[PDB]
Amino acid sequence: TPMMPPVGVQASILSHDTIRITWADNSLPKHQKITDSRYYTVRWKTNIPANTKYKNANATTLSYLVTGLKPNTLYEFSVMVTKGRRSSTWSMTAHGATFELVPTSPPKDVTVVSKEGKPRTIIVNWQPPSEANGKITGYIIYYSTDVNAEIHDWVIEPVVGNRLTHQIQELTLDTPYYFKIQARNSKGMGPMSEAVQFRTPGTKH
Numbered sequence: 001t002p003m004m005p006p007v008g009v010q011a012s013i014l015s016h017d018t019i020r021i022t023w024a025d026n027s028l029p030k031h032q033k034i035t036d037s038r039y040y041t042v043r044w045k046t047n048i049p050a051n052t053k054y055k056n057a058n059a060t061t062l063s064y065l066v067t068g069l070k071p072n073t074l075y076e077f078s079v080m081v082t083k084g085r086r087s088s089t090w091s092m093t094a095h096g097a098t099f100e101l102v103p104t105s106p107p108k109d110v111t112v113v114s115k116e117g118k119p120r121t122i123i124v125n126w127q128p129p130s131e132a133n134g135k136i137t138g139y140i141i142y143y144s145t146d147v148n149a150e151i152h153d154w155v156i157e158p159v160v161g162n163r164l165t166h167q168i169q170e171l172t173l174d175t176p177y178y179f180k181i182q183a184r185n186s187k188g189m190g191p192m193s194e195a196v197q198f199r200t201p202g203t204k205h
């Protein structure tokens with residue numbers, strides 16, 4: 001015999017990894033006291049891609065704390081009830097997106113190449129960090145001719161927005177230069193890459 005599904009399903013954003021789901025049961029008095037053997041099952045998946053697998057959990061309460069979620073990620077949530085051999089279809093879909101977190105991984109695959117026929121110019125390329133934890137609002141490139149120099153003495157080259165390439169001109173020939181890159185998002189700065197070395201070309205004559 002079929003059960004009516006949960007109603008008024010809501011998401012509460014607690015952190016970058018936790019969302020609280022709460023709902024009502026119209027087969028319970030206004031006060032919502034669970035006196036029965038009934039148990040709710042909560043399922044969730046990331047909104048995109050469409051074909052992702054639902055993760056799920058059981059609760060004896062009219063709320064559930066969903067954990068282990070990615071920062072800055074939008075999720076879909078539905079609930080269902082089971083009172084003994086009786087069960088119900090999945091409730092209305094509730095949506096929630098976890099907060100951003102500062103990046104916790106440095107920019108990946110940092111490379112340097114000399115610009116075509118312009119030896120005093122270089123092109124720097126990189127990849128976004130694995131743990132970006134938010135919409136990347138830019139990067140900061142640091143360069144020095146002394147790898148042992150303190151970060152304050154390193155030349156700051158900002159990169160506005162999610163750009164993965166940046167050209168640096170007016171460099172000195174036949175010289176090792178060192179490069180560190182760090183990512184930024186709305187919540188702050190993340191770790192820096194390990195310095196990559198590039199020696200600018202020499203002239204022939």
Ligand SMILES: *[C@@H]1O[C@H](CO)[C@@H](O)[C@H](O)[C@H]1NC(C)=O
Nearest residue numbers: 039040041055056057058059
């Ligand atoms: C919820 O409980 C049912 C019955 O005990 C079980 O089949 C299901 O796997 C449970 N869900 C999880 C995530 O353990």
